[PDB]
Paper text:
The ESCRT-III-like protein Vipp1 couples filament polymerization with membrane remodeling. It assembles planar sheets as well as 3D rings and helical polymers, all implicated in mitigating plastid-associated membrane stress. PspA activity is triggered by agents that threaten inner membrane integrity, including phage, mislocalized secretins, and antibiotics, whereas Vipp1 is a plastid component in cyanobacteria, algae, and plants, in which it functions in thylakoid membrane biogenesis and repair. Given that two-dimensional (2D) planar sheets share a close geometric relationship with helical lattices, and as a means of understanding the interconnectedness of Vipp1 polymers including rings, spirals and planar sheets, we determined the structure of four Vipp1 helical filaments by cryo-EM.
Residue numbers in the entry:
A (entry chain A), B (entry chain A), C (entry chain A): 1 to 55
D (entry chain A): 164 to 217
E (entry chain A): 110 to 163
F (entry chain A), G (entry chain A): 56 to 109
Write the structure that this text describes.
Amino acid sequence: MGLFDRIKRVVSSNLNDLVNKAEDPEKMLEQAILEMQEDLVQLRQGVAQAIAAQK
Amino acid sequence: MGLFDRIKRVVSSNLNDLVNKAEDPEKMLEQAILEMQEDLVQLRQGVAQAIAAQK
Amino acid sequence: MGLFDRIKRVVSSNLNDLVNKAEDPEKMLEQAILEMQEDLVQLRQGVAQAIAAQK
Amino acid sequence: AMSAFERMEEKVLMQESRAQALGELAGADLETQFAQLEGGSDVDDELAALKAQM
Amino acid sequence: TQSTQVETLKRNLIQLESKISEAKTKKEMLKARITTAKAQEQLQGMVRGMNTSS
Amino acid sequence: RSEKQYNDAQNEINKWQRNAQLALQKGDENLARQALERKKTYTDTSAALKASLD
Amino acid sequence: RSEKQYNDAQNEINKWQRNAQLALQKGDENLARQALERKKTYTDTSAALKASLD
C-alpha cells in the first residue's frame, strides 16, 4: 500500500494540522451552538403532524 | 552554517548592544510597570462573566 | 578537485576572515546570551502539557 | 454537531489542565499545601477560641 | 392504539427537550471556563522561577 | 508607606475579626464562616507583608 | 553577587530543612519525603555553586 497510502496520510496530516491550527477556541465555541438546534425544528414539526393526524 | 549564521549573530550583536545601550534604568523602570496590569482587566471581566452565568 | 575546490577554500577564507575580523568580543558576548534561553520556553510548555495530560 | 461539541469539551479541559500545570511546574505548590495543612485545624481552632471567648 | 402511540411520541419529545436544555446550560458553564483560561494563561509566568511573560 | 499599608491591614483585619465575632453572635453560621475565611485570608496576607517588611 | 546568591540559597535551604522538620512533626510522610527530596536537590545545587565560588 505504502507508495500511495502514505502519500495520503502525510498530505492529510498537513491539511488537518492546518485546519486544527486555524481554530480559535472561543469563536468556534460560539459557533458550536448555533448548529445544534437545527434538527430541533423538524422535531417540533413532526410531533405536531403526528398529533394532528391522530386528532 | 558559518557564512550566514555568523553574519546573523554579528549584525544581531550590533543591534542588541545598540538597544541595551539606549536604555536608562529609571525611565524604563517607570515604563516597566504600566504594562504589567493589562491582562489584569480581562481577568476581572472573565471572573465576572463566569459569575453571572453560574448565577 | 583543485581548480574548483581551491577557489572555494580561498574565497571562503576571505569571507570568514572578514566575518571573524568584524567581531567585537564585548558586544557579541552580550549577544551570545540572549539567544541561549530561546528553546527554554518550549521546554517549559512541553513539560506543562505532559503534566496536564497525565493529570 | 455533538462531535464538535465533545472534541471541544476535550479542548477546554485540556486548556484548563495545561494552564494549571504551570503551578506545580513552578516551585510554590508545596508551600501552599504546607499552609493548608498547618491551617486546616487553625480555622476550627479559631472557631473554638471564639466560642470559648463567650 | 392511536392514543397509545401518541403517548410514547409525547414522552420522547419531553425527554429530548430536557436533554438539549441541559446541554445548553453546561455549554454556558464551559464557555465561562475558557474565559477564565484566557485570563490565566495570558496573566501567567509571574513566579520568580520563570519569565515566559514579556 | 509600605509599613503604613501593613498597619492599616492589621487594623482592618482587627475590624473584620470583630465583625466576625459580631456575626457569630447574631449573624448566620454560613456568613460567619465566610467572614472567618476572609479573616484568615487577610491575616495570611498581613503575615506575608510583614515578612516583606523585615 | 554570585556569592550573595549562594548565601541566599544556603539560607533558603536552611528554611526548607526547617520546613521539612516541621512537616515531619505534623505533615504527611509523603509530603515530608518530597520536602527532603527538594532539600537534597537544593543542597547539592548549593554545593555545586560553592565549588564554582572557589
